[PDB]
Amino acid sequence: MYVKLISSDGHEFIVKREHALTSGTIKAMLTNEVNFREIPSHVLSKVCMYFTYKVRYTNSSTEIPEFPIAPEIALELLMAANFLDC
Amino acid sequence: MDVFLMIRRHKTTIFTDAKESSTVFELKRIVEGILKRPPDEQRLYKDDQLLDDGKTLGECGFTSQTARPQAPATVGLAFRADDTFEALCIEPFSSPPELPDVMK
Amino acid sequence: PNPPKLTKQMNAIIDTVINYKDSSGRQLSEVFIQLPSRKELPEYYELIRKPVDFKKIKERIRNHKYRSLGDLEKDVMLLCHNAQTFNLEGSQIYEDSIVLQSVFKSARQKIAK
Amino acid sequence: PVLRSVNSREPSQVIFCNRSPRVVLPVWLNFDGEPQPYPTLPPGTGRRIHSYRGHLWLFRDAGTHDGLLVNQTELFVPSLNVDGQPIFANITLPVYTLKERCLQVVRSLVKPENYRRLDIVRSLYEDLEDHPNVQKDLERLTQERIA
Numbered sequence: 001m002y003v004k005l006i007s008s009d010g011h012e013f014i015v016k017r018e019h020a021l022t023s024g025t026i027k028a029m030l031t032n033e034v035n036f037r038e039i040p041s042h043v044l045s046k047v048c049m050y051f052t053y054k055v056r057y058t059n060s061s062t063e064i065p066e067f068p069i070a071p072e073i074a075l076e077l078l079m080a081a082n083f084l085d086c
Numbered sequence: 087m088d089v090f091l092m093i094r095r096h097k098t099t100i101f102t103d104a105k106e107s108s109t110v111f112e113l114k115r116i117v118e119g120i121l122k123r124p125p126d127e128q129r130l131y132k133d134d135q136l137l138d139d140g141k142t143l144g145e146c147g148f149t150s151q152t153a154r155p156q157a158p159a160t161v162g163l164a165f166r167a168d169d170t171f172e173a174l175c176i177e178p179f180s181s182p183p184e185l186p187d188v189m190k
Numbered sequence: 191p192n193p194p195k196l197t198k199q200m201n202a203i204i205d206t207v208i209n210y211k212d213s214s215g216r217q218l219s220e221v222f223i224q225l226p227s228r229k230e231l232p233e234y235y236e237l238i239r240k241p242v243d244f245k246k247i248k249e250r251i252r253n254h255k256y257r258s259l260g261d262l263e264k265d266v267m268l269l270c271h272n273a274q275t276f277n278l279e280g281s282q283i284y285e286d287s288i289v290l291q292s293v294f295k296s297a298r299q300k301i302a303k
Numbered sequence: 304p305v306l307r308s309v310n311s312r313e314p315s316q317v318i319f320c321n322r323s324p325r326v327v328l329p330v331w332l333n334f335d336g337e338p339q340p341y342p343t344l345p346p347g348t349g350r351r352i353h354s355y356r357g358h359l360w361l362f363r364d365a366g367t368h369d370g371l372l373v374n375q376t377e378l379f380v381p382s383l384n385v386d387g388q389p390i391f392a393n394i395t396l397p398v399y400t401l402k403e404r405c406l407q408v409v410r411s412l413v414k415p416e417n418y419r420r421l422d423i424v425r426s427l428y429e430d431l432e433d434h435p436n437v438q439k440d441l442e443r444l445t446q447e448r449i450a
Contacts, residue, residue, distance in 0.1 A: 002100075002120055007179075007180070008180075009097075009179075009180045010097060011097045011098075011099065011177070011179060011180075012097060012098045012099065013099050013101065014098070014099065014100045014101065014120060015100075015101040016101070016102070019101070040179070040180035041179035041180045042179040042180045042181065042182055043180075043182075045092075045099065045179055047401065048099075048101045049101075049155065049156050049157070049158060050156070050401040051101070052090055052101055052103070052155035052156070052158065053155040053156040053398070054398055054401075055155075056088075056090075056155045057155070057398045058398050059375075061375055061393075063322040063323075063393065063395050064395050064396045064397070064398060065154070065156065065324075065396070066324050066396060067156050067399065067401075067404050068156060068157065069404065069405060069408045070182075071185055071189055071408070071412050072182040072183075072185050073182045074189075074405060074408045074409050074412065075186070075189075075409065075421060075422070075423060076182060077401070077405050078402065078405035078406065078409055078423065078427060079423055079424070079427070081400070081401040081402040081404075081405050082402055082424070082426075082427060082430075084401075085402070086400060086401050086402065186420075186421065186422075188413055188414075188417040188420045188421065189409075189412045189413055189421075223312075224312055
């Protein structure tokens, strides 16, 4: 089952439910929709990337790649990550 | 081996994975699983390049690298209503503000 | 087996000897715990006819091989004497050994007599 | 202390392989559980260390003290080499939390004095200032082990 997440700018981000639960505050908040009034697309897109990554590389005995964060979005993302608890 | 993808239409973005040896028609069957539209109403694009239906994602140019979970490749999607396809349209994301001075 | 008070004395004495440190806080016995293997340092075995390390001495107390304290002294005095044989006069190891004889000798008449 | 090396006096040949994009500082816990720094390993280098059975290692980013994994875990301890076979340590990144990872990046772009010039909630100023640190992961690990 997937779920829809929505930016402040109204972009709609559809990710596997299992990946979204990576956030503690998207466990709570969970029709199968979530608005983030304070989180824009460029941030929320990146957050969904984090979900894909976390799930893929958690418990992986593979060597693991760095998660990239451009300086321009780093503050915004800290805030978002903080808010989502993930 | 897995490739990680953002399937994008207008202001809509699907985060999903799939095999490199998986066909483009397979990808449409997933898209159907979500937007509920049938594959015959769906064109998919690498850039502006329309993707031949019976190619593998592999063949189209998506690979274990360049389509990574933390940097997933983009597949453009366009639908058909009443026998004409729309032009591939992907609304870009917001912009981050000017970098703080304290961060130079 | 030995009377448990002789085997009690023995460990106390040797534990003194070992744990002893100089003013620098450096434990003097430390080199003498373990021997070099024959692959490591084959010449030691060419020159020293009866090799012995503290390891081997402690094991011979657990395994009741020494029957008196005169038996134990002998094997220490051997360790020290071998040290003096293979190593130069006025080498740090030689110095240490000479200390450790007169640490054992004293720490005997203190924990025995 | 509970997290120490044992003085086993039993050699164990070991490979440190740095499969992280970070410059790795290897850290030996001595027999008293005091941590000690070793020469660093560049990304994708691997030296063959002569360590000992029972000795403890953990791995850390040399520049930031960000923690790293080693064979999926936080701590490394060699067994004895079966038949002169060396024991491998893959030093890898962990999956950081998105939050910690963001802290990492910010910290790297901003002098400590300026953390408090950033347009963020006051807690995140403290969160930034709480740098990663070995003695504090040691504490955390110590309480986990006993439990």
